[PDB]
Amino acid sequence: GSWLFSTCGASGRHGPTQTQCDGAYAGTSVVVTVGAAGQLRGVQLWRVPGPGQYLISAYGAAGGKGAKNHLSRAHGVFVSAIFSLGLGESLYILVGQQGEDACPGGSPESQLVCLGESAGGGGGGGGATYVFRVRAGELEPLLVAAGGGGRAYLRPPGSGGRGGAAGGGGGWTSRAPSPQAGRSLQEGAEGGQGCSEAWATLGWAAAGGFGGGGGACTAGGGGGGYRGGDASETDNLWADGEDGVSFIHPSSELFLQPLAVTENHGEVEIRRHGTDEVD
Ligand SMILES: [Tb+3]
Ligand SMILES: [Tb+3]
Ligand SMILES: [Tb+3]
Ligand SMILES: [Tb+3]
């Protein structure tokens, strides 16, 4: 009795298609309906197979590396909690995608930065992983596992993160103030675009990951979350984006200490497990 959810092979600022998830889940226990457009595009709808308690373990996505800030990515957050789910219930699962790395570059000029032949150079914020339901016509969050902030170019309320040229992360209910800000869950949670100044300078810029990651500029993008991580408001050369803020519903039982462990894309595992168990 275990169900594993992934990005279905999708990466970048946009979530997976139905065909991608059908392929990824072929031969597995999982069937999902993927939103095709609007606020739920790329979100995976899973029918709960029966009533009872379930352990939901979610991993938000890592942030991207910066062109000269690459010794490690900011890892996404792991959050795990027990929920009572209903006969007939359906869960919406948005699996966060990694913030884009600055290297290799997506244009000749950005790649020259990556080869030392040089706004720009930052990594995008990672998307958060969201698990939620609809109750009485409203979205109800169950668990949000935050994404990691993107690295800056150089190494020395469900609100959105602050930012500017580098985008803050999207939150649960934030409004995006710019194209670089990560979209909120209510808005469909696409990653922010890289900043226009870097697109103009280098011909490409790293985007935030699906799940509310902010776009890079020189500073790194903020991670998605229940609250989005802040990014620099001045495109500072050394300012990594902040990770997002995670969430568990007040009625659930947090099972394990949250940890920053996700290496690349997010994931969710669900299994039958409850407070009837001692461990
Ligand atoms: Tb902050
Ligand atoms: Tb694994
Ligand atoms: Tb049992
Ligand atoms: Tb038993």
UniProtKB/Swiss-Prot annotation:
Q: Where is the sequence biased in composition, kind Gly residues?
A: 158-172
User: Region (Disordered): which ranges?
Assistant: 153-192
Query: Which locations, inside or outside the cell, does it occupy?
Result: Cell membrane
What domain of life does the UniProt record list for this protein's source? Eukaryota
Q: Which cysteines are joined by disulfide bonds?
A: 8-21, 103-114, 195-217
Q: Which residues lie on this side of the membrane: Extracellular?
A: 1-273
**Organ and tissue specificity:** Expressed in non-hematopoietic cell lines and T- and B-cell lines.
Q: What does this protein do?
A: Receptor with a tyrosine-protein kinase activity. Following activation by ALKAL1 or ALKAL2 ligands at the cell surface, transduces an extracellular signal into an intracellular response. Ligand-binding to the extracellular domain induces tyrosine kinase activation, leading to activation of the mitogen-activated protein kinase (MAPK) pathway. Phosphorylates almost exclusively at the first tyrosine of the Y-x-x-x-Y-Y motif.
Family membership: Belongs to the protein kinase superfamily. Tyr protein kinase family. Insulin receptor subfamily.
- Tell me which disease this protein is linked to: Genetic variations in LTK that cause up-regulation of the PI3K pathway may possibly contribute to susceptibility to abnormal proliferation of self-reactive B-cells and, therefore, to systemic lupus erythematosus (SLE). SLE is a chronic, inflammatory and often febrile multisystemic disorder of connective tissue, thought to represent a failure of the regulatory mechanisms of the autoimmune system.
Subunit structure comment from the entry? Homodimer; homodimerizes following ligand-binding. Part of a complex including LTK, TNK2 and GRB2, in which GRB2 promotes LTK recruitment by TNK2.
Protein name (record): Leukocyte tyrosine kinase receptor
